[model samples]
Structure formats: C-alpha cells, structure tokens
Target: GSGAVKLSVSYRNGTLFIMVMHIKDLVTEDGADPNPYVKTYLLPDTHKTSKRKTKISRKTRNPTFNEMLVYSGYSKETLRQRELQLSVLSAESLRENFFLGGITLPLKDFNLSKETVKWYQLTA
Candidate 1:
C-alpha cells in the first residue's frame, strides 16, 4: 500500500515536534480550529529518579485521553525532573478539533494532572 504524504513541523527552544499526516486523511477545515492548543511541556530544573520507564493508566472517549509531564533540566544535560500535571479538554474544544486521522503535538501544556500526563506518556 502507498499514497501521497504530507508533513508539518513545529519547534520551541531546542526541542522539536514533528507531525506527519497522509493526504487522504486530510479532512476539510470546515472553518473550525480542528486542533486544540493546550499548554506546552517544559523540562523543569530538578529530576532525580532512576526509573527508565513510565507507566500509563487509563483512557477516555472524545478521542483525546492525553497527558502531560514536564521534565526540567539544562539543555546540555537531559533533564529527568518530571513534574506531573493534569488537564482536560472542554466539550466544545474537543468537538471543534480532533480530526479523523492521527494528530501529534508536543505535550506542550505545562499545567496538567499526574494521571493525565502518565496516561499520555505511557501511550507515547
């Protein structure tokens, strides 16, 4: 199987976020945001854990069921100071956005719940 391909890229500071969506999967804008913008994840400045893996917990409808974790540290040294936070999408926001195909964004939002973040990271 093969088809046309399209890609989008966004970045901040030294971090990079890349998104790739197939042409066939692209839906009409419908004059809607079609994408919700939440806070971004920034590595804080203090993490000291020996854990190499994170566990994911649960998921919900609305198609999102995402999470956020802010790992802080200087760019020189990969930061592991993980700050857990929770966040949720409003009914309106979820409906307006959430395209049919895959949509990947930087776990940008810094403010979120630990459960939410773990849920998303586990999947990620």
Candidate 2:
C-alpha cells in the first residue's frame, strides 16, 4: 500500500531536532556485536551452575548517525511542503488537570494539515 503503517519523520537544524520514532530500525544490527559466552569456556563468576540465574550486565549508548543519507528513507520530492505541527501529551505535566481520582479525558485533538507531516518541532 502507498500509505505506510509504520512511518516516521525527522527535522533538524543546528541544536534543535525533532524526530518521530517508528518501528523501522527498532532492532537493527547497525552496531550490534555478537554475544561471546555461549558454551566454550567457564570462569568462576561467569559460569551459570544452578537453575536460578543471577542478574547480568547491560549495555547502553547514544544513537549513531550512520551516514549523510543512510537512515533517511523518503525523498525530497515526496515531501515538497516544509511545515509541520506536532502535539505531545505528557501524563506527568497534565497531572493538575486530573478529575475524579486522576481520570481526566483528553480535551484536544488536531486534524493536522499535510504540511504538518512534512515538518515539526519537539521539546522536552
């Protein structure tokens, strides 16, 4: 289909950058390394002996920009417009508007123009 279910748009200029996170490269292997310990060696603290396993280590880092045109999917022609409007509803900030045991319904919705899809801004 021409309409994509999983679609994202990114707009960046200097320090300000707006990004929409879709599921496209959610689990991609652009920088992933193969697991080392499978069955070959067994060290004292590293070996798993019993049925219940202990807590293991974890990894984290910043997002990498692979190339100038690698991650970008759509073309400039498909997105001729250059204006976008996006809205974010934060549960933490909207706490004051809570009614009847913190169950307040949303008060606003927007039928954004196609320009809103071309470009937008986001802030924390």
Query: Candidates' TM-scores?
Result: 0.22, 0.18
lDDT of 1 by residue, 15-84 (tens): 4332222222222235432222222233342344321211221222222312322232233123223322
Model 2: lDDT of residue 69? 14
Q: Where does model 2 exceed 4 Å of error?
A: 1-71, 92-124
lDDT of each residue in 1-124, candidate 2, tens digit only: 1111121233232111222321111121334321110011111212342111112112211112221111122234322332222222211232331110101111122122221232122222
Q: For each candidate, how many residue pairs have backbone atoms clashing (under 3 Å)?
A: 16, 2
- Please give the RMSD to the true structure for each candidate, in Å: 13.9, 21.5
Residue 8 Cα positional deviation in candidate 1, in Å, after optimal superposition: 14
Worst 10 residues of 1 by lDDT: 115-124
Clash pairs for candidate 2? 84-116, 84-119
| Best model number under TM-score | 1
